[PDB]
Amino acid sequence: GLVGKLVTQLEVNCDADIFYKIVKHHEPNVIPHFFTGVQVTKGDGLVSGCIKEWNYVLEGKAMTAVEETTHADETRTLTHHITEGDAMKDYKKFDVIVETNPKPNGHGSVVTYSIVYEKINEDSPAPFDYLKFFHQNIVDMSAHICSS
Amino acid sequence: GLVGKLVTQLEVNCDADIFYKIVKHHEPNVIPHFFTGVQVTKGDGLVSGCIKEWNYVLEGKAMTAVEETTHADETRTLTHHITEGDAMKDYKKFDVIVETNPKPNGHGSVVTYSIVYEKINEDSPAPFDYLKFFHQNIVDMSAHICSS
Numbered sequence A, B: 001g002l003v004g005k006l007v008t009q010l011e012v013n014c015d016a017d018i019f020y021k022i023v024k025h026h027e028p029n030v031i032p033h034f035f036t037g038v039q040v041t042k043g044d045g046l047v048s049g050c051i052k053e054w055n056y057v058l059e060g061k062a063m064t065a066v067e068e069t070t071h072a073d074e075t076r077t078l079t080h081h082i083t084e085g086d087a088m089k090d091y092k093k094f095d096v097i098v099e100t101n102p103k104p105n106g107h108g109s110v111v112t113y114s115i116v117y118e119k120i121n122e123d124s125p126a127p128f129d130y131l132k133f134f135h136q137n138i139v140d141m142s143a144h145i146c147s148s
Ligand SMILES: COc1ccc2c(c1OC)C(=O)O[C@@H]2[C@H]1c2c(cc3c(c2OC)OCO3)CCN1C
Pocket: A027, A028, A031, A032, A033, A034, A054, A055, A056, A057, A058, A064, A065, A067, A080, A082, A087, A096, A133, A134
């Protein structure tokens, strides 16, 4: 079993469009990390995404990744496409999709982080360490937001 | 953020209906575990599910759970409803849903394990330890199945 998807989904008490705009422009200073890179424009000169080389520590180990980020405001979706780095030692493909939708309910939101992956071989782990990291990051972010 | 869902999804090279029937009637002897319990019938005397008290070891720690299992052959869905045990020290609600579907592709299958949870409080973990356990269990099972 080489192709798979891991998901964490969380309910948040926040309008979906508002929350998407917050996620779009905000990424946990206690965790060691920084990036360098560039922004990407669409042709009208407005930034449409970015390409970042990250340096970060995951479960104690220093790592690097190169990620291209795109967004879809119409569907409140952010897509992170990893092309290089430590994760590519385990995965042929590694993409992180973040979606925010109103609860069928109506008022609050459901945020979904999906990691869509293809392992290099059967001996590769599934990216549970990344899922927990992304989960804790969005829980941390959401805990700094309140009504009104 | 108290309500959420964790998912692992895996592609398997097996007809969906065949694979569902295998999952339905098969549960990793190297992991210490046993259950006692009863089967549940629907009214025509045929077994429709079961109610099990499990004793198992998760990440080294002995635990117990009481689980009621139901199935839906029409949708190839198994549902495990945990009512008691160590997990209920962290979660108000804990349900494990296993779905098997044909690939839009056509030939093989996509298996989805979902853990639908509600934490007791903000200090409760999300059930990443259970997700990894269920994942490894279905990978182990699927590795013992081959074509023809
Ligand atoms: C605190 O340090 C970090 C900063 C930012 C991120 C992470 C991180 O700490 C492990 C991370 O995990 O998520 C993001 C980053 C990122 C993504 C995907 C990645 C990745 C990333 O940056 C490290 O590297 C491997 O695949 C998707 C989202 N994007 C914003």
